[PDB]
Design a binder for this molecule. Structure first.
Ligand SMILES: CCc1cc(Cl)c2[nH]c(C(=O)O)c(CCC(=O)O)c2c1
Ligand SMILES: CCc1cc(Cl)c2[nH]c(C(=O)O)c(CCC(=O)O)c2c1
Ligand SMILES: CCc1cc(Cl)c2[nH]c(C(=O)O)c(CCC(=O)O)c2c1
Ligand SMILES: CCc1cc(Cl)c2[nH]c(C(=O)O)c(CCC(=O)O)c2c1
Ligand SMILES: O=P(O)(O)OC[C@H]1O[C@](O)(COP(=O)(O)O)[C@@H](O)[C@@H]1O
Ligand SMILES: O=P(O)(O)OC[C@H]1O[C@](O)(COP(=O)(O)O)[C@@H](O)[C@@H]1O
Ligand SMILES: O=P(O)(O)OC[C@H]1O[C@](O)(COP(=O)(O)O)[C@@H](O)[C@@H]1O
Ligand SMILES: O=P(O)(O)OC[C@H]1O[C@](O)(COP(=O)(O)O)[C@@H](O)[C@@H]1O
Lengths: 320, 329, 318, 318
């Protein structure tokens, strides 16, 4: 076939949509930052920190995405896990899109060299007022585009839009993201479950039951396999590729979940839905929750449609 | 205080031991293979497989799955070290006997790309290696690999995760080296590393719960429902041994792969998964048990023999063994 | 100044026009190709050919640029040093642009690891006829965009358009061309002359005097320095950065010059003229020569204005 | 099958019944070459030009210096960057003297032309304490010499008693790969290399030799001219393709420009070990007895029949 790169793809989609080119420039600018995060995560230059010539990853990742999006002339408001407040882009470098991002998700346990990621979500400013944090408090339903970069065994960018979910592998030799999986869809039912079972004594009765139904199948089926990496980008990527269910529900330390709706839960929910999968808080869809805080936390149960539905049936047999 | 590379370290250690060079050349040939596996695992040249020059079919055997390419890289690099007689791998049913002209003294049992079953999900993967000496007089055979893990000369792993790190355990201790992909050199980042006495993380597939033996079932409940009114232990299971055991060494805690049903003598293979990681653990002040015995004290009968494995922080493995000893009989 | 990339620059400049989007894809396809050539010229994977798993550069350069420009859906006619006849692109992948390129200029001496390059010149199909070789026989004054890629100590793409000349360094760590020099303009007069002096016997009288005026200055000033790599991309790039003059004039073996108008002479003349410099054949401007063959050779004297005008004064005296 | 520099230096040291110090020195120096290559190809350039908001000759020196000191194999280190010999601290002192040029050609690195790292290794003459006199040895006493070319691709050329061996860097895995074994030069070439901008300040012998190549007296083809202005590149071309490289003596530079210890001597050893020659006009570069660490020497090196022809013309004018 002829090589389809991210750059050719984002240009072709904008040209067929006869668009301005601001969405294309955002995604190009974001992927140049993802390439730079990947170089830094794989530790290029570590010899210079250890004295080859005689002589931050969280922050650098944020500084890379921030600077690359501000110089895009395509963003107005930027929300980062790292920045406690929204960034309002200077007037002269302003564009029509609001971007909610998590620069290096999983960096908590990056000392063990566990898979880390960049989670992103793009909205349009619908308001007529001056750029403010309020332009970022849109429900996931209004997402123009979303996705994640995985810095695992190789680096991959998953781009979810209305065309579908597209998977691009970084070729470090040329710095190009090669489309390796087009219009990807999730399995209707998987065989893997993912959650921290260390919060067992703190779990909701409904979670406790669903987990025991996978370990000890009532329908005399095969017991599910357990996988929990501790990095949402890695756990959710395996959920898209292999199928199954990722859960981060309420515990006690975190009674509204740990994971953050705007730049963790909402982007992943958009990827899942566009890939024929589901994503709930237990009560509603992640994409239907209207936010009040940029750093608001939210429960997430995402994956293979039938597996999310099975969970929801247990929640129903326990709640309102 | 001053910089060091894997190459310099292994060459200086061999001169300090006034040695032949065979171990030093083996370890350098193994590390050249590890930089090559890293380049391919990070998908360098994938553009050529997707028509950047418009040519796929079967090109330069780059259509090989990364577990075959990894094995072919480790096998050809080790054979050309002039340091190997017998080579055991996860990919080859019978041991490889190295042609007389390239034969050396060491037996290597290795796992070329551990976790490759799920490499579609871009899971952290690794090369696990264990180096033994031929203590036999008979013509090189598979029996030369059937040595217990106490007889090991050196052992360790390459993790292909966020970054690529070689962990090389010897009698000098465990040394951790980071691959700088800019210069193609492993940089000594962590020296004579020691595992924590007690951790706060447990790692096992709890989807095998209905088949878990009572000792595993109790120990797990002790970490979720602690007696001491302590914080419950956290759960991490990547599903790649290299990744889970690396986290056990850096953060502390316990990695368990027990048995019963499906794989009933454990799953993980003793010669090229369990023993390598047990030597790293024991050289870092950690522990590695099958429950009944220490992994390193198991005398192997087959090269693809499996073993049960509970490894990590000394106090954590000892707590498990107390629970096991109550249910042992 | 804020950071810019080649891909960002080309998308911003192409957004300015309503745009078909074809020229932006063409330039981004040429960008991807140049990074591929750069990797292969720096000898990435050579260990595979020498036994790592125990299991061309000029041709591979041509195949990459040909395939990348065919799959841009923006090219109709492709002329290359490598192919004797022009390439007429398949109807389904056809666009409005005619690209004339030298895929790896200097690769005759690439065994000594000499600096090499990719020279490119993009024209618009101006005919209503079926795409043909004749669509490449446009004068250099009709160039829409031109430039080169130098694979030397580092890889740089120099892109010339109406907006002027912009120089972008490839950061191989991230695989991105970083804009390092904006709206570049050449020095008025330099201190370096560039030509193969082994042809002194077959040299035109005027070149003989110009070189004798650089070695033995008439203004009792400092003699010029001589640099000649034998790769045009290297010599013209030095001419642009440090100033001076590059000459490949006529001789006996090459009475109409050696370097090729369409994919060597014209592309480099556009970059020089967009940077406030000059490029002459002696008789006329390189860009004003109407091509008759796609492999037509042309004499070239390019560089710093005062230097090319001093040569032109001696040409008028002879 | 696969021969790397690591396996080469280890095998050659075992064939020499050696300690392992020189092997360590060459592994350490080759780590520094890889790190210079990364910097020279501008990896990270994006961090300088603002991708996240918020020297090459000095870096090259610092890399080579620290890698040679941490090798525990050096006692005296002479660089072009330091006016005084560096006496390695007693706690990492070894038995070898290294004279090196960290980035030869860096004057003109802004034009992205080929650059290099030139090196020469001697053994300490002393049995007492190390001094600059342990570096003031003639090139005959060299144990190992060579150069790293950062051109189209990165190559380390290592010359020893075993001969001259060429290693290509695979940037993908960071290994130097044996690609040309016991290399030897052409008996006669067809390329001459010199800055002809010094034509008025030239010796009558140099004037004649250059005229014999431009205007052949034997009705042979006139020779070609190549002068990159980076010695590493010009001498590598001379080795791979043949011919002559001349940085001769002017009346403005009576002892030449290029430095005996870390430019002329190292390249004279490579030429001699490849069946070529290297003269100052009066004597062999390797036979000259150094009196100053930054001493300049004239250098005419390359294919044997070409340097001999020069010497015949030098004799006529002596
Ligand atoms: C999947 C649909 C899509 C994809 C990409 Cl990549 C796009 N890029 C641009 C652009 O203008 O750059 C647009 C049009 C956006 C607008 O006008 O609503 C666009 C639409
Ligand atoms: C830490 C101990 C060690 C480490 C390395 Cl890296 C070594 N390399 C070699 C070698 O001979 O190459 C030896 C000695 C071998 C022998 O004891 O038989 C050796 C010993
Ligand atoms: C010379 C200034 C320029 C630069 C770039 Cl990068 C351009 N890109 C595009 C484009 O639309 O692709 C155009 C307009 C011509 C078309 O319609 O093809 C364009 C013009
Ligand atoms: C081919 C000549 C050579 C090459 C290498 Cl690579 C060497 N390495 C070592 C060493 O000391 O390891 C020596 C010893 C000879 C000395 O003392 O100069 C040696 C000799
Ligand atoms: O450690 P826990 O409680 O199981 O939660 C891990 C979760 O926290 C996260 O790391 C997010 O937080 P960090 O970016 O600070 O690491 C998720 O990637 C991941 O799902
Ligand atoms: O899926 P399970 O049964 O939990 O087993 C996981 C184990 O299998 C392994 O992947 C080994 O198998 P592969 O090398 O074939 O993938 C271990 O690294 C890992 O601990
Ligand atoms: O060796 P000469 O006669 O000076 O010609 C050199 C010229 O030929 C070229 O090398 C072009 O030919 P190639 O593309 O075949 O190498 C120019 O790059 C250079 O200016
Ligand atoms: O420009 P000139 O006078 O011809 O000198 C060029 C010579 O100087 C050098 O550049 C050495 O000087 P630098 O190391 O300062 O660049 C040689 O590489 C080269 O042979």
């Amino acid at each position: 076939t002829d090589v389809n790169t991210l750059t050719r793809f984002v240009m072709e989609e904008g040209r067929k949509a006869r668009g301005t080119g601001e969405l294309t420039q955002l995604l190009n600018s974001l992927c140049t930052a993802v390439k730079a995060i990947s170089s830094a995560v794989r530790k290029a230059g570590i010899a210079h920190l250890y004295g080859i010539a005689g002589s931050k990853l969280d922050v650098l990742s944020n500084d890379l995405v921030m600077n690359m999006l501000k110089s895009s002339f395509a963003t107005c408001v930027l929300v980062s896990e790292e920045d406690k407040h929204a960034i309002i882009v200077e007037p002269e470098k302003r564009g029509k899109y609001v971007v909610c991002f998590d620069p290096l998700d999983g960096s908590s346990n990056i000392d063990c060299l566990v898979s880390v990621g960049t989670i992103f979500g793009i909205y349009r400013k619908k308001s007529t007022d001056e750029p403010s944090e309020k332009d970022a408090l849109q429900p996931g339903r209004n997402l123009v585009a979303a996705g994640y970069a995985l810095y695992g065994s190789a680096t991959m960018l998953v781009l979810a839009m209305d065309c579908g979910v597209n998977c691009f592998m970084l070729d470090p030799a040329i710095g190009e993201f090669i489309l390796v999986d087009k219009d990807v869809k999730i399995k209707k039912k998987g065989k893997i479950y993912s959650l921290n079972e260390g919060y067992a004594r703190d779990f909701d009765p409904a979670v406790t039951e669903y987990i025991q139904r996978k370990k000890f199948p009532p329908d005399n089926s095969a017991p599910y396999g357990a996988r929990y990496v501790g990095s949402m980008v890695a756990d959710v990527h395996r959920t898209l590729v292999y199928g199954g269910i990722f859960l981060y529900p309420a515990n006690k330390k975190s009674p509204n979940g740990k994971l953050r709706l705007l730049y963790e839960c909402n982007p992943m929910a958009y990827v899942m839905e566009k890939a024929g999968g589901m994503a709930t808080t237990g009560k509603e869809a992640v994409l239907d929750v209207i936010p009040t805080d940029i750093h608001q936390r939210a429960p997430v149960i995402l994956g293979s449609p039938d597996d999310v539905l099975e969970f929801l049936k247990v929640y129903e047999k326990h709640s309102a």
